[model samples]
Target: SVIKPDMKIKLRMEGAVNGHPFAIEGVGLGKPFEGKQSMDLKVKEGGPLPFAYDILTMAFNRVFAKYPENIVDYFKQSFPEGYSWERSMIYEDGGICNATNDITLDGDCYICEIRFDGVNFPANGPVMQKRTVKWELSTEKLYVRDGVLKSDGNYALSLEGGGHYRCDFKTTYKAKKVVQLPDYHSVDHHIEIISHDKDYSNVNLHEHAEAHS
Candidate 1:
């Protein structure tokens, strides 16, 4: 379980697709934290208004604490696809049976990765896919992935290094809301920091069935 009290949220969508408790957290606040120290965002609301957070804040506070203002900015501008990152590297799970993707990015872009098993995500046997969505918040997260759109499934998260190569991953998050869920169900309160870039592979997700279950 990676979810904590503050990390969890519940919202009322005035007009969601059939009141389905659209759960979408890849990871939360727990021991096996997938999102504990990764890039993500949070929006007060969705629908025209935009706002968000800088994922690098964790790095700023934890690893690179007060080196210099410019250096701080440099980390903020840490681009995996950097022209200067000639020695950048890409990593994969090194397996085919697992649903996965080949992450690709540019050296000059802001890039990072995360992989968290979530509740209300893809469950059961068959793998599914969640539609590509933008950060409803003002500061949207930046990255890319590819796959069919449908439900919140497991995700193999990874990133490209300086645009030279993409990191490998076994994140499979593909699901669909077949039946609408209850409005006040314990599941309606879910979140996933996401964006859309059609470069990733199909999320042949297995199941975040119940690390908490």
Candidate 2:
């Protein structure tokens, strides 16, 4: 079964960047296709930063992409409380990054502690400099029911030279698909053109342009 076209997803992000507080919220429609999900998010509450909304959107997209069809059951069976998994990868641009996920279960919700080290990120402004960033993110509680997902999470991003960010978030997802319409039309055109460059040897002319429907 595929996701319906009417499903809705809502997200709220609240956090502090370099000791300043900020918040953002938005909503999106669900798509049956994995990569088709999109959100129209904005910094609607609390103090706003230049990159706060962007970072939050990126983090949400990353986590949401990990959702599987049997996510709830898979986590319950494979990643029991206290279980941990780690992976390492080398990015094409640069940097060797490592990621870890630790799991826990509480009643009807699942908690996932996620960490990333040595992730490469570009510096602010026009400089082409890149830096390694560390992330400490967690889903305090996540619930799934009837193809819907609801979660409360925390996020932290740390870099050298006192660049730090911390935030709390709540997200909910429901399945949906987008519809496309069809168009039909026909046309015919006839034209003639002549061109020459420079002096008398360079001139351009067009004549006898016709069209039919």
Candidate 3:
């Protein structure tokens, strides 16, 4: 068994926005190429206004426009083409090997933790004002080998401006059963062993006996 080039991913996320709880379910594709990886997510359902829209709007206001005429105008200026979010991260050096296996898959797994600092949010905004917010996601177990690619962990959005605007969510990503796509490749690495033994001590005796019969 081996990991494929491209695979479909399902996302299950539930969290809150400024203490207002919300949940989101989506589906996307996971592509790991060269030394980087990216996941494109599309929201399936999460009420009329999803948590992503809120957070993204806040981020845009902080960076581009400090203050806008209204919330509706702000959203249109911020996202001209709509809210299509994609996460890109370095795959090779982004994570560490897990000490304990949390998943049932048969492969090498890693623990990846993402932290986004200096995420400023302007004051008088709908979410918060003149504060720095932190966005973090720590993957408990991430497997990308042996014909499997799956991960599950917790996500956090903490504020340090003035008032509380915290969000805690749990999320999981599983590979879908679909054919591989072009221009993508698996992130698996296999080691080949070549041995020369006279006593056959390095070989499997059970397999050798079965073959002889």
lDDT of each: 0.20, 0.34, 0.25
lDDT of 2 by residue, 100-200 (tens): 44444343232444443333433452112323244443333445544444444444545456565454444443322221211211111111113322221
Order the candidate numbers by lDDT, best to worst. Answer: 2, 3, 1
Clashes of each: 37, 5, 3
lDDT (10s digit) by residue, model 3, range 67-120: 122221211122222122212221121221111111111222111212121122
Clashing pairs in 3: 122-130, 123-129, 123-130
CA RMSD for every model? 20.3, 21.1, 24.1
- Candidate 1 lDDT over 46-140, as tens digits, reads 32211111111111111111223222121112223211110111122221121121221232222223211212223221112322232111111
Worst 10 residues of 3 by lDDT: 204-213
- Name the candidate that leads on TM-score: 2
Weakest 10 consecutive residues of candidate 2 by summed lDDT = 184-193
Residue ranges of candidate 1 with Cα displaced over 4 Å: 1-115, 122-127, 138-213
Cα shift from native, residue 136, model 1 (Å): 1.3
- Ranking, TM-score, top scorer first: 2, 3, 1
Shift of residue 93 alpha carbon in model 2, Å: 15
